[PDB]
Design an enzyme around this catalytic site. Structure first.
Site, PDB file in Angstrom:
ATOM      1  N   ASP A  65       0.351  -2.957   7.614  1.00 56.65           N
ATOM      2  CA  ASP A  65       1.314  -3.882   6.655  1.00 56.65           C
ATOM      3  C   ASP A  65       2.116  -5.178   7.425  1.00 56.65           C
ATOM      4  OD1 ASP A  65       3.089  -4.030   4.434  1.00 56.65           O
ATOM      5  OD2 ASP A  65       4.876  -3.400   5.961  1.00 56.65           O
ATOM      6  N   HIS A  83       1.478  -7.910  -7.184  1.00 62.43           N
ATOM      7  CA  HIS A  83       1.849  -7.633  -8.302  1.00 62.43           C
ATOM      8  C   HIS A  83       3.468  -7.143  -8.109  1.00 62.43           C
ATOM      9  CE1 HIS A  83      -2.384  -7.194  -9.282  1.00 62.43           C
ATOM     10  NE2 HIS A  83      -2.036  -7.956 -10.305  1.00 62.43           N
ATOM     11  N   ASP A  92       4.953  -7.496   6.364  1.00 60.61           N
ATOM     12  CA  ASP A  92       6.475  -7.562   6.115  1.00 60.61           C
ATOM     13  C   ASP A  92       7.058  -6.743   6.823  1.00 60.61           C
ATOM     14  OD1 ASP A  92       5.648  -9.709   4.399  1.00 60.61           O
ATOM     15  OD2 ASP A  92       6.907  -9.342   2.964  1.00 60.61           O
TER      16      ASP A  92
END
Ligand SMILES: [Ca+2]
Ligand SMILES: [Ca+2]
Ligand SMILES: [Ca+2]
Ligand SMILES: [Zn+2]
Ligand SMILES: [Zn+2]
Lengths: 156, 163
Positions: free
Chosen positions: B7, B93, B9
């Site tokens: 990941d 999204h 962030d």
């Protein structure tokens, strides 16, 4: 007698652009600078940054324009474990004819350390002249021919 | 082949607590030790894949240009220091989009799920949220929940190179 590395900023730790890193999008790190400085620290070198910043504070190089990229560069080094004992800055223009512009020794007067095992590392002849003026070794950084992996291997 | 699916962030760099998006340079900050520790992991044979949900990226809520400055600098730092991500996989999204690619769905990493694509026993998702850990479960691999204090980059570096 501490071993010191007196390291230039522009063109040595980070890429040199009008020759001033006055925008975030002009900041880029030199290859391998982080792991190699970590290696050098592990070998007992202390780090001191010394930089000429022509006209820092003027219309052509506002302090705030320097601060953003510099502070971020410092965030990255520090978060990765690279520590600079001092960051020594000369903000003057060459036409100013000041006391502190490399290769003058003013900024480093207090260090004047294990001279035989201390170095100025920088990418200009003036950094090498600073080393001579300080009575220590000089390493002329070159991204292609005398770069961070080479320096890290050599000095350890 | 062992992979680390990581990941961005809150994991490689800090997560802004207001809008959870790094859309200015003054919101970019590397997590402690991420560079030396990823170099250590690579040296032990891990390949790296970045996988990130970036809600609304490329729209007025998070303009591409705003993401690009900080992201490209982050990538420049990684690359210049020797940290290489095989792929940077992005879901742009919103949650209400109900897309196929938002973690913890596996669409973005489907190629890695092919029969002999990876060593599942020794591959990991590393992230700071439950959705990263659920991604791991859905992929049939291990999950490490990043925590700056209690499961940090030095710890991960040590844990995953243990012999
Ligand atoms: Ca220079
Ligand atoms: Ca996250
Ligand atoms: Ca986010
Ligand atoms: Zn000066
Ligand atoms: Zn998606």
């Amino acid at each position: 007698s501490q071993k010191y590395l007196f390291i230039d900023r522009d063109g040595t730790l980070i890429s040199e652009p009008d020759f001033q890193v006055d925008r975030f999008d002009k900041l880029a790190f030199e290859p391998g600078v982080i792991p190699q400085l970590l290696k050098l620290q592990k070998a007992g070198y202390k780090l001191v940054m010394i930089t000429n910043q022509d006209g820092l504070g003027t219309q052509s190089f506002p302090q705030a324009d320097f601060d953003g990229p510099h502070n971020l560069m410092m965030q990255i080094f520090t978060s990765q474990g690279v520590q600079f004992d001092e960051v020594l800055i000369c903000p003057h223009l060459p036409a100013d004819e000041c006391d502190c512009r490399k290769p003058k020794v003013k900024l480093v007067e207090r260090y004047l350390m294990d001279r035989a095992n201390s170095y100025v590392i920088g990418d200009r002849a003036t950094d090498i002249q600073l080393a001579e003026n300080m009575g220590i070794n000089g390493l002329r950084y070159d991204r292609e021919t005398l770069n961070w992996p080479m320096i890290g291997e050599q000095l350890t």
